[PDB]
Amino acid sequence: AGSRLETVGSIFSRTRDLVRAGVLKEKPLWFDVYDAFPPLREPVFQRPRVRYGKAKAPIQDIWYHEDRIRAKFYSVYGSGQRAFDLFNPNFKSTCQRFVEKYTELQKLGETDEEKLFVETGKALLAEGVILRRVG
Amino acid sequence: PRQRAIQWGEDGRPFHYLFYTGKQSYYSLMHDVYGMLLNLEKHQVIGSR
Amino acid sequence: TKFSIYPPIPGEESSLRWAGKKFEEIPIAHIKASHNNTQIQVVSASNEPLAFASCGTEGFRNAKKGTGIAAQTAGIAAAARAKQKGVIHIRVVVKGLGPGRLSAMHGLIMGGLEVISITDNTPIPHXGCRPRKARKL
Amino acid sequence: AKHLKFIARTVMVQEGNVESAYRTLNRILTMDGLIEDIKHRRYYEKPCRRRQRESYERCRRIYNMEMARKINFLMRKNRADPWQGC
Amino acid sequence: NVESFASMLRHSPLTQMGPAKDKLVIGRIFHIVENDLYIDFGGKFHCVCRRPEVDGEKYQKGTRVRLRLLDLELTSRFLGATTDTTVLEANAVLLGIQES
Amino acid sequence: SNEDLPISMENPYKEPLKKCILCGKHVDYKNVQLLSQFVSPFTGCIYGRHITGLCGKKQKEITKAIKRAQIMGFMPVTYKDPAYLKDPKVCNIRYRE
RNA sequence: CCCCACUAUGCUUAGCCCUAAACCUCAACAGUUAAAUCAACAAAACUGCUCGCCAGAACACUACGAGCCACAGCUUAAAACUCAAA
Ligand code: FES
Ligand SMILES: [K+]
Ligand SMILES: [Mg+2]
Ligand SMILES: [Mg+2]
Ligand SMILES: [Mg+2]
Ligand SMILES: [Mg+2]
Ligand SMILES: [Mg+2]
Ligand SMILES: [Mg+2]
Ligand SMILES: [Mg+2]
Ligand SMILES: [Mg+2]
Ligand SMILES: [Mg+2]
């Protein structure tokens, strides 16, 4: 004797109720573990609905201040002929090296954007970095 | 007919890890053959039917 | 020079010639390919008639006036009368989608004429007379 | 009537190949819609019928273009089985 | 002073790369089926590239290669669908082999 | 709170929208050379936007310019003026052999 | 039904006539996408508010009355007899 109404409550609620009603003579092996360490959400069937009108998902695009510097760097100098190595968790691309220098010079008090971008390229050229302008 | 003896013990636990496929012997064979093909890569007619 | 499917434009200086004659001077074979007949008239560049042949003038009648072999026969007949008058190269201007549209051109070639260009002048009204109602068959 | 002649719908013959010249002319008139336009103009299409066909054609093109796009997208995985035996 | 997830995500190479279109990345061949090379390049999905005609035998399991990325995941929504169809693979062009 | 959290802003990597070849340019009915690039050489038929690649706005401007130029005495109707056959081919249509 | 010829008519002008499967077969306005998504199909499901309209079938786009440049017309629109379905 039991219940296969998987869309009515949860396996816990259905099992708990039938144990109270005496329908289940013994509790299942998992019941005491679920009770002691329950999930964050009780697993209850729900029907996913489609959004209409002015309803929008709450997920937000992930952006950072440095993304503005990256967009300009890719436009001006393009993607570096050096290849990304996404297996190394500490990999630094020419763009990231550019962003770090750009951040340092901003903290030194410079506030202009067009001037803070030209001085950064010079610093890297002095350090031996290859910056071939796309156009 | 050599129907395999009960495929679980007294505690009810099936003996073979692929019991719940319903075809444990067939899938145990496919698993063994698929595994051999993997190891070869790591390392690297008329008579019968 | 590479071949151009575009005809030479009158007034420009082209190098193409046919028996020493320019494109503007080549006689014209006017083929009217109707649904029930095919009419062919060969005229000079000055619009002087040189030869006329149709399926009806070649002894075909009624449902026979509108076939491929009837138009081919009309083309041969017009080519013969045109060749006697000194025609070798012709410009083909065909109007209509009848059965003798292409066959009438073959007959002109089998009759001894050389086609240097093909022009379609099938009348297409740009908005014009209302056509008759669909046939209930 | 008032235009210059031997410019519109005019194809020159190459090396006496009149069959290829006629096919080129027929292909031009087909792509420009003339061949099918002459045929539809033999008898009067009633305005309600023209709108019905123009709407059916428009929707069959959209449906065929969308079905081709789907088949192309799902044909990337037509490669051999990478996990044969599993 | 335990690093947070927000910090890992900000400073990850995949985050720093920005858009993936026309980005050169280093991949590794992990599975081969005939002339189909399955290449992992650090993303969610592998890409599948055909063995190049020149130096085809140089491309083996473990060989590191240069790729030009086009899409991290090939997905498209087709008419009358509530979600997107995904082929569960990245789109990339195999350029050659990476050597030191 | 935390400095490494994402910040709200507009996509910095967003690419500009596409533009037709005639975006930002005046289409005059007297510029028959430009208009001739969008009509059929053999029949003078105006090309649809699927051939010209123009946007809805410029497809309409070109169409209206052609119709005005034709009936005002600047442009032929039944064929492309042969003077303009050697202009840049900007239309996605292949005709000959 | 097919072919030929030809007329009212399709056009213009000045008056009428006032109909349509005049149909997105979806009343106007405002709002919502969370609840149960929802008889079915069509075209995801609803809320507030207002006007119009409906109350078995058939008789009936009918009869009578009334109004109308309408006169073999239009609009509004019954009842009796009949049925257990429609
Ligand atoms: S895209 Fe701007 S006018 Fe065409
Ligand atoms: K309707
Ligand atoms: Mg009359
Ligand atoms: Mg009129
Ligand atoms: Mg209507
Ligand atoms: Mg109302
Ligand atoms: Mg339902
Ligand atoms: Mg009733
Ligand atoms: Mg009525
Ligand atoms: Mg009445
Ligand atoms: Mg009355």
XYZ file of C-alpha atoms (C1' of nucleotides) and ligand atoms in Angstrom:
704
model
C 0.000 0.000 0.000
C 1.430 3.326 -1.081
C 1.097 6.304 -3.391
C 2.494 6.812 -6.896
C 1.021 10.335 -7.127
C 4.389 11.938 -7.779
C 2.763 15.306 -8.609
C 0.967 15.459 -5.226
C 3.391 16.844 -2.661
C 6.785 15.204 -2.255
C 8.009 11.687 -1.556
C 8.573 12.841 2.027
C 5.107 14.322 2.556
C 3.386 11.365 0.890
C 5.479 8.881 2.880
C 5.037 10.727 6.179
C 1.257 10.846 5.746
C 0.811 7.173 4.847
C 2.947 6.186 7.839
C 0.654 8.214 10.103
C -2.450 6.661 8.531
C -1.007 3.205 9.211
C -0.950 2.366 5.505
C 2.829 1.842 5.584
C 3.795 -0.604 8.324
C 7.473 0.418 8.249
C 9.224 3.630 7.293
C 11.546 3.368 4.272
C 15.275 3.257 4.897
C 15.747 6.820 3.620
C 13.008 8.509 5.658
C 15.039 9.064 8.830
C 17.961 10.486 6.840
C 15.726 12.914 4.941
C 14.178 14.038 8.229
C 17.540 14.633 9.914
C 19.205 16.293 6.892
C 16.442 17.583 4.609
C 17.095 19.334 1.295
C 16.977 23.100 1.014
C 13.806 22.809 -1.084
C 11.181 20.126 -0.564
C 10.990 18.263 -3.899
C 7.458 19.091 -5.063
C 6.466 18.783 -8.706
C 5.912 22.090 -10.463
C 4.930 22.858 -14.035
C 7.329 25.307 -15.732
C 5.347 28.210 -17.153
C 6.197 30.541 -20.027
C 6.652 34.240 -19.332
C 4.355 36.748 -21.019
C 4.022 40.512 -21.182
C 6.346 42.416 -18.848
C 7.762 39.358 -17.046
C 11.506 38.840 -17.453
C 14.031 36.456 -15.953
C 16.050 37.890 -13.034
C 19.397 36.663 -14.391
C 21.797 39.570 -14.898
C 24.663 39.897 -17.351
C 28.078 39.647 -15.700
C 30.189 42.723 -16.476
C 33.293 44.280 -14.952
C 34.869 47.714 -15.178
C 37.867 46.208 -16.972
C 35.560 44.910 -19.716
C 35.424 48.461 -21.080
C 39.217 48.438 -21.372
C 39.101 45.009 -23.022
C 36.545 46.113 -25.614
C 38.703 49.085 -26.600
C 41.920 47.048 -26.618
C 40.414 44.435 -28.937
C 39.110 47.164 -31.243
C 42.397 49.085 -31.362
C 44.930 46.236 -31.320
C 42.789 43.177 -32.061
C 43.281 39.793 -30.482
C 46.906 39.071 -29.704
C 48.708 36.686 -32.020
C 49.622 34.934 -28.776
C 47.185 32.095 -28.113
C 45.036 31.840 -25.004
C 45.919 28.920 -22.724
C 42.736 28.423 -20.708
C 44.171 25.344 -18.972
C 46.629 27.441 -16.961
C 44.522 29.106 -14.222
C 47.046 31.971 -13.960
C 47.359 32.674 -17.688
C 47.786 36.350 -18.575
C 47.051 37.562 -22.093
C 48.375 40.733 -23.683
C 44.956 42.264 -23.015
C 45.108 41.361 -19.321
C 48.650 42.732 -19.137
C 47.306 45.878 -20.793
C 44.413 46.035 -18.322
C 46.728 45.705 -15.323
C 48.984 48.523 -16.524
C 45.921 50.612 -17.382
C 44.654 50.067 -13.836
C 47.980 51.061 -12.270
C 48.164 54.341 -14.184
C 44.584 55.233 -13.249
C 45.420 54.785 -9.561
C 48.333 57.220 -9.976
C 45.725 59.978 -10.373
C 45.312 60.133 -14.150
C 41.620 60.412 -15.027
C 41.448 61.076 -18.779
C 40.489 58.010 -20.806
C 42.051 58.765 -24.198
C 45.282 59.865 -22.502
C 45.336 56.932 -20.069
C 45.064 54.556 -23.045
C 47.948 55.963 -25.103
C 50.391 56.063 -22.184
C 49.624 52.415 -21.400
C 50.663 51.235 -24.858
C 53.975 53.071 -24.570
C 54.772 51.419 -21.232
C 54.280 47.951 -22.723
C 56.370 48.764 -25.799
C 59.135 49.816 -23.404
C 58.807 46.417 -21.705
C 59.143 44.648 -25.068
C 55.495 43.812 -25.784
C 54.362 43.638 -29.413
C 51.313 45.838 -30.078
C 50.431 45.837 -33.787
C 47.535 48.222 -34.380
C 44.831 46.597 -36.490
C 44.385 49.713 -38.635
C 16.621 -24.407 -18.124
C 19.633 -22.675 -16.626
C 17.828 -19.615 -15.370
C 20.413 -17.970 -13.165
C 19.923 -18.502 -9.456
C 18.391 -15.629 -7.524
C 20.449 -12.614 -8.544
C 20.523 -11.256 -4.978
C 21.269 -12.583 -1.510
C 19.188 -12.618 1.641
C 19.664 -8.879 2.207
C 18.153 -8.271 -1.241
C 21.260 -6.650 -2.723
C 21.899 -7.819 -6.308
C 25.237 -9.512 -6.882
C 26.070 -7.780 -10.174
C 26.543 -4.014 -10.425
C 24.544 -3.961 -13.696
C 21.553 -5.883 -12.307
C 19.084 -3.029 -12.737
C 19.709 -2.938 -16.490
C 17.860 -6.257 -16.765
C 20.613 -7.457 -19.129
C 23.585 -7.579 -16.781
C 25.362 -10.367 -18.667
C 25.007 -8.694 -22.063
C 26.010 -5.251 -20.785
C 28.825 -6.704 -18.688
C 30.201 -8.149 -21.930
C 29.776 -4.880 -23.839
C 31.471 -3.093 -20.940
C 34.449 -5.464 -21.066
C 34.832 -5.156 -24.840
C 34.495 -1.366 -24.787
C 37.170 -1.222 -22.097
C 39.606 -3.274 -24.163
C 39.212 -0.952 -27.150
C 40.181 1.916 -24.838
C 43.338 0.234 -23.537
C 44.631 -0.530 -27.037
C 44.494 3.157 -27.975
C 46.414 4.018 -24.801
C 48.975 1.397 -25.831
C 48.895 2.503 -29.483
C 37.524 -15.300 -42.527
C 36.933 -18.621 -44.271
C 38.259 -20.650 -41.347
C 35.635 -19.618 -38.794
C 32.368 -17.713 -38.399
C 38.853 39.162 -75.952
C 36.335 37.378 -73.743
C 32.861 36.682 -75.102
C 30.043 39.039 -74.106
C 26.434 37.843 -74.134
C 25.416 41.511 -74.125
C 24.702 42.797 -77.652
C 26.892 45.555 -79.103
C 25.422 48.966 -78.339
C 24.726 51.159 -81.400
C 26.942 54.218 -81.632
C 29.832 52.602 -79.772
C 32.882 51.292 -81.627
C 32.744 47.493 -81.593
C 35.045 45.080 -83.408
C 32.393 42.416 -84.049
C 31.461 41.882 -87.692
C 29.448 39.361 -89.705
C 30.322 39.283 -93.414
C 31.631 42.818 -92.974
C 28.299 44.025 -91.560
C 27.740 45.531 -88.126
C 25.169 44.253 -85.646
C 22.856 47.146 -86.548
C 22.853 46.002 -90.201
C 22.046 42.295 -89.752
C 18.520 41.343 -90.906
C 15.973 40.333 -88.285
C 13.889 37.155 -88.100
C 10.639 37.947 -86.278
C 9.115 34.755 -84.852
C 5.600 34.946 -83.405
C 5.098 31.710 -81.448
C 1.382 31.577 -80.684
C -0.513 28.751 -79.002
C -2.128 27.596 -82.268
C 0.312 28.839 -84.931
C 3.812 30.138 -85.616
C 4.567 33.085 -87.904
C 8.057 33.979 -89.141
C 8.962 37.154 -91.031
C 12.524 38.011 -92.052
C 13.165 41.727 -92.574
C 16.214 43.826 -93.356
C 17.750 46.292 -90.918
C 15.767 48.991 -92.760
C 12.524 47.043 -92.164
C 12.229 45.771 -95.736
C 10.317 42.457 -95.831
C 12.392 39.627 -97.277
C 10.527 36.396 -96.481
C 7.424 35.230 -94.641
C 6.401 31.730 -93.618
C 3.901 30.347 -91.132
C 2.553 26.905 -90.329
C -0.644 27.879 -92.136
C 1.177 28.890 -95.321
C 3.058 25.560 -95.254
C -0.115 23.476 -95.577
C -0.700 22.738 -91.892
C -4.263 23.255 -90.697
C -6.207 23.401 -87.420
C -4.545 21.429 -84.582
C -1.533 20.740 -86.821
C -0.715 24.437 -87.262
C 0.513 24.407 -83.656
C 3.300 21.858 -83.258
C 7.077 21.786 -83.179
C 7.484 20.071 -86.543
C 5.073 22.549 -88.137
C 7.093 25.522 -86.883
C 10.354 23.855 -87.916
C 8.889 23.466 -91.408
C 7.862 27.131 -91.453
C 11.379 28.138 -90.430
C 12.925 26.151 -93.277
C 10.512 27.790 -95.718
C 11.309 31.321 -94.534
C 15.035 30.549 -94.541
C 14.855 29.383 -98.159
C 13.101 32.525 -99.400
C 15.420 34.705 -97.308
C 18.604 32.965 -98.465
C 17.630 33.632 -102.085
C 17.570 37.363 -101.279
C 21.093 37.357 -99.831
C 20.540 36.622 -96.122
C 23.080 34.575 -94.158
C 23.187 36.021 -90.635
C 19.975 36.938 -88.811
C 18.975 38.370 -85.449
C 16.098 36.391 -83.934
C 13.311 38.277 -82.149
C 10.765 35.808 -80.747
C 7.540 36.918 -79.046
C 5.354 34.310 -77.374
C 5.676 31.006 -75.534
C 4.021 28.801 -78.138
C 5.276 25.364 -79.171
C 7.126 26.777 -82.186
C 9.217 29.198 -80.149
C 12.420 27.127 -80.257
C 11.529 24.842 -83.172
C 11.012 27.811 -85.499
C 14.596 28.853 -84.755
C 15.973 25.393 -85.555
C 14.282 25.461 -88.953
C 15.938 28.783 -89.755
C 19.324 27.178 -89.078
C 18.557 24.009 -91.041
C 17.574 26.307 -93.909
C 21.058 27.815 -94.083
C 20.839 30.894 -91.832
C 23.202 31.669 -88.951
C 21.638 33.081 -85.780
C 23.919 35.617 -84.083
C 21.562 36.707 -81.280
C 18.212 35.872 -79.693
C 15.817 38.523 -78.375
C 12.559 37.941 -76.506
C 9.808 40.506 -77.084
C 6.870 38.655 -75.551
C 4.335 41.376 -74.606
C 4.061 41.759 -70.832
C 1.585 44.470 -69.749
C 2.697 46.491 -66.741
C -0.698 46.603 -65.021
C -3.047 46.900 -69.369
C -6.124 45.051 -70.568
C -7.951 42.613 -68.325
C -7.477 39.039 -69.609
C -10.396 36.730 -70.284
C -11.766 34.575 -67.483
C -10.291 31.159 -66.732
C -11.602 28.281 -68.832
C -13.811 25.919 -66.806
C -12.065 22.674 -67.694
C 7.534 50.310 -78.017
C 9.270 53.624 -77.424
C 12.482 52.057 -76.113
C 15.588 51.042 -78.025
C 15.517 47.553 -79.512
C 17.959 44.647 -79.214
C 18.964 45.576 -75.654
C 16.232 44.087 -73.466
C 16.119 40.290 -73.170
C 18.887 39.898 -75.764
C 21.550 37.179 -75.610
C 24.395 36.779 -78.099
C 25.219 33.376 -79.573
C 28.691 31.928 -78.969
C 30.364 29.653 -81.528
C 26.999 28.943 -83.129
C 25.742 27.275 -79.933
C 22.116 28.363 -80.171
C 20.895 25.770 -77.656
C 23.053 27.289 -74.915
C 22.024 30.810 -75.938
C 18.342 29.874 -75.750
C 18.846 28.202 -72.367
C 20.616 31.312 -71.070
C 17.758 33.525 -72.260
C 15.201 31.159 -70.730
C 17.133 31.180 -67.450
C 17.207 34.989 -67.440
C 13.464 35.284 -68.043
C 12.767 32.661 -65.369
C 14.884 34.314 -62.669
C 13.357 37.725 -63.410
C 9.880 36.200 -63.091
C 8.764 36.840 -66.670
C 8.087 33.249 -67.758
C 5.819 32.640 -64.766
C 4.312 36.117 -65.157
C 3.331 35.541 -68.791
C 1.667 32.268 -67.798
C -0.347 33.744 -64.919
C -1.470 36.542 -67.267
C -3.140 34.268 -69.831
C -6.314 34.174 -67.708
C -7.555 36.622 -65.097
C -6.749 35.696 -61.507
C -9.398 37.092 -59.198
C -7.922 39.448 -56.564
C -9.047 37.254 -53.662
C -7.324 34.298 -55.345
C -4.104 36.215 -56.001
C -3.823 37.237 -52.344
C -4.418 33.633 -51.267
C -1.657 32.296 -53.519
C 0.763 35.134 -52.745
C 0.241 34.394 -49.047
C 0.637 30.634 -49.479
C 3.835 31.078 -51.493
C 5.274 33.526 -48.955
C 4.608 31.057 -46.133
C 5.956 28.019 -47.983
C 9.225 29.867 -48.602
C 9.520 30.825 -44.929
C 8.726 27.247 -43.915
C 11.167 25.705 -46.395
C 13.951 28.124 -45.464
C 13.350 27.370 -41.782
C 13.349 23.607 -42.380
C 16.601 23.802 -44.347
C 18.208 25.834 -41.563
C 17.165 23.202 -39.019
C 18.530 20.312 -41.087
C 21.850 22.072 -41.685
C 22.185 22.815 -37.969
C 21.408 19.236 -36.895
C 23.647 17.676 -39.567
C 26.825 18.762 -37.768
C 26.524 15.651 -35.582
C 26.232 13.274 -38.562
C 29.839 12.205 -37.920
C 30.691 8.636 -36.958
C 29.831 7.365 -33.490
C 32.581 8.486 -31.058
C 31.452 6.232 -28.182
C 30.531 3.065 -30.059
C 29.811 0.255 -27.625
C 28.304 2.553 -24.977
C 40.989 35.157 3.838
C 39.205 32.498 1.771
C 38.812 33.405 -1.894
C 35.186 33.902 -2.907
C 33.519 32.565 -6.034
C 33.052 36.095 -7.378
C 36.833 36.505 -7.185
C 37.580 33.239 -8.994
C 35.149 34.172 -11.761
C 36.528 37.687 -12.264
C 40.147 36.524 -12.599
C 39.535 33.356 -14.610
C 41.132 33.225 -18.086
C 37.767 32.301 -19.604
C 36.216 35.441 -18.111
C 39.166 37.602 -19.176
C 38.974 36.322 -22.760
C 35.725 38.185 -23.383
C 33.837 37.155 -26.515
C 35.062 33.918 -28.045
C 34.575 34.785 -31.724
C 37.922 34.954 -33.538
C 39.992 34.185 -30.434
C 43.093 32.017 -30.692
C 43.201 29.288 -28.039
C 45.324 26.218 -27.353
C 43.461 22.912 -27.439
C 44.342 19.316 -26.619
C 43.231 16.271 -28.596
C 41.635 13.846 -26.135
C 39.650 11.536 -28.433
C 40.067 10.518 -32.077
C 37.554 8.730 -34.316
C 38.979 8.051 -37.778
C 39.720 11.564 -39.097
C 37.598 13.398 -36.490
C 39.658 15.122 -33.789
C 37.927 15.861 -30.479
C 39.721 18.827 -28.929
C 39.302 20.342 -25.467
C 40.325 23.997 -25.165
C 39.272 24.852 -21.603
C 35.570 25.495 -22.219
C 32.368 23.696 -21.319
C 32.258 21.760 -24.603
C 34.882 20.250 -26.866
C 35.158 21.065 -30.561
C 35.387 18.517 -33.380
C 37.786 19.280 -36.237
C 38.707 17.110 -39.210
C 42.291 15.900 -39.453
C 44.275 18.310 -41.675
C 45.456 16.925 -44.999
C 49.053 18.056 -44.381
C 50.898 16.335 -41.521
C 47.790 14.356 -40.634
C 49.818 11.791 -38.696
C 51.168 14.481 -36.351
C 47.695 14.900 -34.802
C 47.390 12.229 -32.109
C 45.859 11.870 -28.666
C 47.525 14.430 -26.421
C 48.740 16.635 -29.271
C 48.277 20.310 -28.442
C 46.887 22.408 -31.284
C 46.003 25.992 -32.151
C 42.343 26.864 -32.711
C 40.389 29.927 -33.802
C 37.192 29.974 -31.762
C 33.816 30.821 -33.280
C 31.307 29.758 -30.612
C 31.658 28.144 -27.195
C 28.340 26.317 -27.668
C 26.450 25.867 -30.937
C 22.794 26.588 -30.179
C 19.852 27.856 -32.197
C 16.144 28.351 -31.565
C 13.919 27.051 -34.349
C 10.399 28.160 -35.188
C 7.812 26.830 -32.756
C 10.316 25.931 -30.021
C 10.170 27.048 -26.393
C 13.902 26.521 -25.792
C 17.143 26.396 -27.795
C 18.466 23.370 -29.650
C 22.075 22.611 -28.695
C 24.470 20.191 -30.387
C 26.630 20.130 -27.225
C 29.864 21.138 -28.947
C 31.890 24.274 -29.562
C 32.610 25.725 -32.999
C 36.284 26.257 -33.821
C 38.652 26.153 -36.794
C 41.800 24.049 -36.462
C 44.832 26.056 -37.584
C 47.708 23.703 -36.779
C 49.951 22.290 -34.057
C 51.496 24.195 -31.156
C 55.238 23.664 -30.728
C 57.961 25.036 -28.472
C 30.447 44.434 0.550
C 32.602 42.658 -2.044
C 34.679 44.349 -4.736
C 34.796 41.401 -7.156
C 31.021 41.186 -7.607
C 29.688 41.945 -11.104
C 28.592 45.506 -11.831
C 25.572 46.661 -13.809
C 26.302 48.336 -17.147
C 25.730 47.999 -20.883
C 27.511 45.410 -23.003
C 31.008 46.813 -23.729
C 31.780 44.098 -26.300
C 28.572 44.690 -28.252
C 29.182 45.078 -31.955
C 27.525 47.797 -34.037
C 24.414 46.877 -35.944
C 24.787 45.933 -39.580
C 24.307 48.593 -42.233
C 23.293 48.397 -45.860
C 25.680 49.631 -48.533
C 23.559 52.794 -48.856
C 23.053 53.547 -45.151
C 23.716 57.237 -44.582
C 23.697 58.281 -48.253
C 21.145 60.352 -50.146
C 19.291 58.508 -52.916
C 18.379 60.928 -55.706
C 16.177 60.108 -58.682
C 18.724 61.909 -60.883
C 21.554 59.550 -59.853
C 20.678 56.961 -62.475
C 24.090 55.299 -62.159
C 23.331 54.302 -58.565
C 19.742 53.297 -59.333
C 20.851 51.188 -62.304
C 22.856 48.953 -59.950
C 19.569 47.599 -58.524
C 17.684 46.734 -61.737
C 17.996 43.698 -63.965
C 20.335 44.214 -66.949
C 18.146 42.226 -69.338
C 14.623 43.162 -68.196
C 14.990 46.345 -66.134
C 13.130 44.666 -63.273
C 13.735 46.162 -59.837
C 15.502 43.643 -57.610
C 13.975 42.604 -54.322
C 15.800 43.247 -51.075
C 16.843 39.582 -50.952
C 19.019 40.324 -54.007
C 20.069 43.916 -53.286
C 20.818 43.375 -49.593
C 19.306 46.779 -48.841
C 17.281 47.485 -45.726
C 13.570 48.222 -45.828
C 14.115 51.980 -45.796
C 16.669 52.087 -48.616
C 14.840 49.410 -50.610
C 11.870 51.788 -50.586
C 13.940 54.883 -51.395
C 15.592 53.119 -54.338
C 12.249 51.787 -55.570
C 10.584 55.196 -55.326
C 13.606 56.857 -56.937
C 13.594 54.398 -59.850
C 9.872 54.876 -60.491
C 10.271 58.659 -60.411
C 13.376 58.636 -62.615
C 11.767 56.306 -65.160
C 8.604 58.341 -65.761
C 10.381 61.719 -65.617
C 12.743 60.816 -68.467
C 15.992 59.901 -66.681
C 16.001 56.086 -66.645
C 14.818 53.369 -69.061
C 12.155 50.954 -67.862
C 12.543 47.786 -69.942
C 16.328 47.427 -69.645
C 19.351 48.647 -67.739
C 21.076 51.489 -69.556
C 24.077 49.802 -71.249
C 26.364 52.635 -70.121
C 26.108 51.273 -66.564
C 26.761 47.580 -67.252
C 30.402 47.886 -66.109
C 29.605 49.466 -62.735
C 30.336 47.615 -59.478
C 28.073 44.578 -59.130
C 26.535 44.897 -55.658
C 23.618 42.494 -56.219
C 23.616 38.813 -55.244
C 22.375 37.458 -58.576
C 24.235 35.283 -61.104
C 22.845 35.154 -64.651
C 25.092 34.241 -67.549
C 25.921 30.721 -68.795
C -19.226 23.319 -69.501
C -15.781 24.877 -74.882
C -15.446 28.581 -79.343
C -17.070 33.464 -81.878
C -19.718 38.083 -81.735
C -21.969 41.486 -78.695
C -24.991 44.112 -74.439
C -26.268 45.669 -69.173
C -22.263 46.147 -66.061
C -16.962 47.069 -64.417
C -14.860 53.461 -65.779
C -16.146 59.148 -65.325
C -19.712 62.675 -63.468
C -24.229 63.809 -60.393
C -27.736 61.474 -57.302
C -29.374 57.136 -54.898
C -29.392 51.963 -52.778
C -27.093 50.609 -47.505
C -25.973 44.761 -48.296
C -21.241 40.631 -47.465
C -18.130 34.335 -44.844
C -18.487 43.593 -44.170
C -14.333 37.401 -40.600
C -8.187 38.297 -36.786
C -15.534 34.458 -37.176
C -10.889 37.605 -31.062
C -16.279 44.173 -28.450
C -13.575 49.078 -26.135
C -10.254 50.524 -22.267
C -6.760 49.203 -18.320
C -3.784 45.459 -16.060
C -1.130 40.630 -14.900
C 2.215 36.303 -16.281
C 1.607 34.294 -10.125
C -1.932 31.023 -9.125
C -5.401 25.874 -11.334
C -2.084 26.202 -17.532
C -6.330 24.437 -19.633
C -13.593 20.580 -21.278
C -12.162 20.239 -26.773
C -10.420 22.732 -31.056
C -9.040 27.607 -32.624
C -5.543 31.861 -31.185
C -1.082 30.678 -24.031
C -4.367 31.578 -19.388
C -6.620 35.340 -16.822
C -8.210 40.099 -13.812
C -10.720 45.054 -13.442
C -14.283 48.126 -15.905
C -17.950 49.540 -19.423
C -21.339 49.165 -23.489
C -23.742 45.805 -26.931
C -25.920 41.056 -27.144
C -27.785 35.880 -25.786
C -31.346 32.178 -22.936
C -33.699 24.393 -26.756
C -34.534 23.182 -32.074
C -37.451 24.534 -36.148
C -41.118 27.910 -37.881
C -37.677 32.593 -39.183
C -32.438 36.839 -43.182
C -40.411 34.712 -42.315
C -45.669 37.168 -40.953
C -47.719 41.747 -39.160
C -46.559 46.840 -37.566
C -43.289 50.878 -38.246
C -39.385 53.739 -40.859
C -36.709 54.422 -45.241
C -35.167 58.562 -52.473
C -35.343 51.749 -51.194
C -41.590 49.402 -54.797
C -39.658 41.327 -56.739
C -35.915 46.197 -51.637
C -33.517 47.188 -46.681
C -33.736 47.646 -41.202
C -36.195 46.075 -36.707
C -38.695 41.334 -35.841
C -42.872 37.669 -33.654
C -46.719 33.881 -32.774
C -49.576 29.385 -33.594
C -49.137 24.409 -34.964
C -44.545 20.638 -34.446
C -40.495 18.078 -32.114
C -36.911 15.416 -27.757
C -33.716 16.625 -29.319
C -31.058 20.583 -32.214
S 20.908 50.054 -42.760
Fe 20.784 52.217 -42.352
S 19.662 53.024 -44.065
Fe 19.909 50.886 -44.536
K -12.173 35.016 -42.521
Mg -20.300 48.249 -72.698
Mg -9.190 54.888 -64.430
Mg -12.943 42.152 -46.011
Mg -17.951 49.359 -28.155
Mg -5.703 20.752 -22.692
Mg -35.059 29.563 -30.113
Mg -30.032 39.238 -46.406
Mg -37.971 41.014 -44.663
Mg -44.187 44.884 -44.267
